[PDB]
Design a protein around this ligand. Structure first.
Ligand code: OLC
Ligand code: OLC
Ligand code: OLC
Ligand code: OLC
Ligand code: OLC
Ligand code: OLC
Ligand code: OLC
Ligand code: OLC
Length: 510
């Protein structure tokens, strides 16, 4: 049951996600949304996101299958040797990249955030934070490799808990080290650094428990390393396209007023809060199922899995996007507006979040529909569609920046994701790969009715409540949780009244 899989993934990631939002709230309270946070987000978050794009789009899809074949077809000694050579090559490459990026950090910041050049102190702070960021890439890459090995041995709780330590270390660095750092946010940077270390050392004993903890070594003649490189080859183009798109979006953001990057960051975090599970969970668990369907010839199961993923997208991401748009002020004020995060920052974050809610659905649908081509050994069509999406994204950025500013950049990304999803779906329909099952009309009608009930309940409750800035954090968060509970319970109650049953949707998972 893939619904069971999504529940398990949610339960395993809950604690880390909660602490990540506590960390974001601490950052907002102590540093607000200004030049220092902009420098931190450009220097740390952008390289981390580029690294994650490369790791999940290229490295893992090549390393995990070869590791599983070593585990199942070869012995533990040959597998340990393969792991040692993999880790050694990764460590050497990332050490070279760390050195080169520390030496070239000013030009890196220059081309990724040109608008920062009119403020020399902000630029220097960004370059300094990037110089601290670069070793974290190597640390967190080794930690990710450990997590992948542990997942291959069916150990998912430990890697899903690992980022808790990063969040805790960042929080402690802000609370205890920021008063002693000359630019205070510098402490946060080191809190990330130590975090990486912790995330590694937390997973090393478990690696030793399964007999897969080995010293790294270098070898340019290992069969497995060449197998992984050959499988990594055809994904570099797809990785580079999304990397370039993110870099140009950052370039556009760098020319806006101080705080725009931070407002966008807080908005996208708020958007990720309820739907962080579905996005990646559905994709990673649907790709192997559809691959097996296509290999066995069971086209009915392929169609049913795809249709179930799409219907779950409609059933869970749509109400979240609508409710996030409606509750933008309650969310921003109850979660962020404390200390140096002012009401102005709250309003700007609300604008960006409302812009992001338009494309939440496009993102969740893209992550489900891309395996429709990936499972059939088709990397070319998603890359073509992604190139077109990049072109449209930059066109809309150029058109929207002067008037809508940061919110306009967010809306550009949202519309681009929407049309990315639509192009993927229309390609699937065109090649006769997928055709939806019967009963989408009644499904959508009941969905619309439940959504109307939810919106009515939300607006009714919001019309009765005092200004959200009055009251301390306890009061605000209690009110927000109560309103969210009422909205969600009304939505699911309407869904049940109109015929939706949990058993019936679980049967479509498998
Ligand atoms: C809006 C300003 C005029 C148009 C700029 C388009 C730049 C396009 C290319 C950027 C990549 C990096 C190349 C180097 C860019 C340096 C830009 C710079 O330093 O701009 C400082 C200025 O004060 C800022 O308003
Ligand atoms: C820079 C300074 C860094 C200082 C770092 C200090 C870290 C202290 C540890 C706290 C434990 C974390 C919270 C534990 C809460 C319960 C954890 C638990 O039981 O988790 C089991 C796990 O899910 C099974 O996989
Ligand atoms: C104020 C609120 C702002 C935020 C709002 C967030 C939600 C927006 C999403 C709407 C769903 C639209 C779905 C349209 C796409 C599905 C139908 C479709 O694609 O139909 C053509 C297809 O070819 C048939 O096979
Ligand atoms: C916000 C828009 C962009 C982001 C989201 C992109 C969604 C892409 C399509 C998803 C599956 C749609 C399946 C539609 C199946 C319709 C089948 C049909 O013929 O339905 C007959 C019924 O009577 C009346 O619809
Ligand atoms: C790996 C690197 C890949 C690089 C790929 C090439 C990037 C070339 C430049 C992009 C557009 C820059 C546009 C800059 C000017 C538009 C923003 C103008 O922004 O004004 C801002 C102002 O604050 C309100 O209007
Ligand atoms: C059907 C859809 C129904 C609605 C779906 C959800 C919509 C968004 C609501 C989220 C509330 C989250 C409340 C808790 C947020 C985390 C707060 C926390 O633990 O830390 C923040 C604090 O400020 C640190 O000091
Ligand atoms: C234009 C200049 C931009 C400069 C700023 C960005 C530089 C760093 C980004 C990527 C390189 C490093 C990529 C490292 C990938 C490691 C993959 C890995 O370890 O993956 C383990 C596991 O498989 C995971 O699931
Ligand atoms: C991980 C990424 C590594 C970099 C990827 C390519 C970036 C190319 C961009 C611009 C030219 C940069 C030329 C840099 C020439 C050396 C500068 C140098 O060594 O400067 C030392 C000085 O002390 C100050 O740190």
């Amino acid at each position: 049951n893939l619904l069971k899989s999504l529940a398990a993934i949610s339960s395993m990631t809950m604690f880390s996600r909660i602490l990540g939002f506590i960390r974001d709230a601490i950052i907002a309270r102590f540093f607000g949304a200004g030049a220092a946070t902009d420098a931190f987000f450009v220097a740390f978050r952008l390289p981390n996101l580029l690294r994650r794009i490369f790791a999940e789009g290229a490295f893992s899809q090549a390393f995990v299958p070869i590791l599983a074949e070593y585990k199942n077809q070869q012995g533990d000694e040959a597998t340990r040797t393969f792991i040692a050579y993999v880790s050694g090559l990764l460590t050497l490459i990332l050490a070279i990249v760390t050195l080169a990026g520390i030496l070239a950090a000013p030009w890196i910041i220059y081309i990724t955030a040109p608008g920062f050049t009119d403020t020399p102190d902000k630029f220097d702070l960004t370059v300094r934070l990037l110089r601290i960021t670069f070793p974290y890439i190597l640390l967190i890459s080794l930690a990710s490799l450990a997590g992948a090995i542990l997942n291959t041995w069916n150990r998912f709780s430990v890697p899903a808990f690992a980022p808790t330590l990063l969040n805790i270390s960042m929080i402690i660095s802000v609370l205890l080290l920021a008063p002693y750092c000359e630019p205070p946010i510098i402490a946060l940077g080191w809190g990330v650094f130590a975090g990486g270390i912790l995330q590694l050392l937390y997973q090393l004993p478990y690696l030793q428990k399964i007999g897969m903890l080995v010293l790294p070594r270098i070898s340019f003649r290992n069969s497995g390393v060449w197998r992984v490189l050959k499988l990594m080859g055809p994904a570099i183009i797809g990785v580079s396209v999304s990397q370039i798109s993110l870099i140009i979006n950052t370039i556009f953001a760098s020319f806006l007023q101080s705080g725009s990057v931070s407002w966008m960051y807080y908005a996208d975090r708020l958007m990720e809060l309820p739907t962080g599970v579905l996005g990646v969970a559905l994709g990673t668990i649907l790709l192997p199922s559809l691959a097996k369907s296509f290999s066995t010839g069971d086209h009915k199961e392929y169609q049913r899995l795809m249709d179930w993923g799409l219907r779950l997208c409609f059933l869970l991401a749509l109400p979240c996007a609508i409710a996030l748009a409606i509750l933008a002020e309650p969310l921003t004020v109850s979660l962020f507006q404390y200390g140096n995060f002012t009401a102005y920052d709250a309003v700007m974050t609300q604008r960006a979040l409302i812009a992001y809610c338009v494309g939440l659905m496009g993102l969740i649908v893209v992550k489900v529909l891309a395996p429709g081509f990936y499972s059939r050994q088709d990397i070319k069509t998603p890359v073509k569609i992604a190139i077109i999406t990049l072109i449209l994204t930059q066109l809309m950025n150029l058109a929207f920046i002067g008037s809508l500013k940061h919110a306009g950049l967010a809306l550009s990304i949202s519309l681009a994701a929407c049309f990315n999803a639509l192009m993927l779906y229309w390609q699937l329909r065109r090649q006769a790969i997928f055709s939806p099952l019967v009963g989408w009309g009644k499904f959508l009608l009941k969905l619309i009715a439940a959504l109307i009930v939810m919106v009515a309940v939300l607006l009714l409750l919001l019309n009765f409540m005092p200004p959200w800035e009055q009251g301390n954090m306890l009061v605000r968060i209690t009110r927000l949780l109560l309103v969210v509970f009422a909205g969600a319970m009304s939505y699911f109650a309407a869904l049940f009244i109109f015929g939706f049953r949990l058993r019936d949707f679980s049967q479509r998972a498998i």
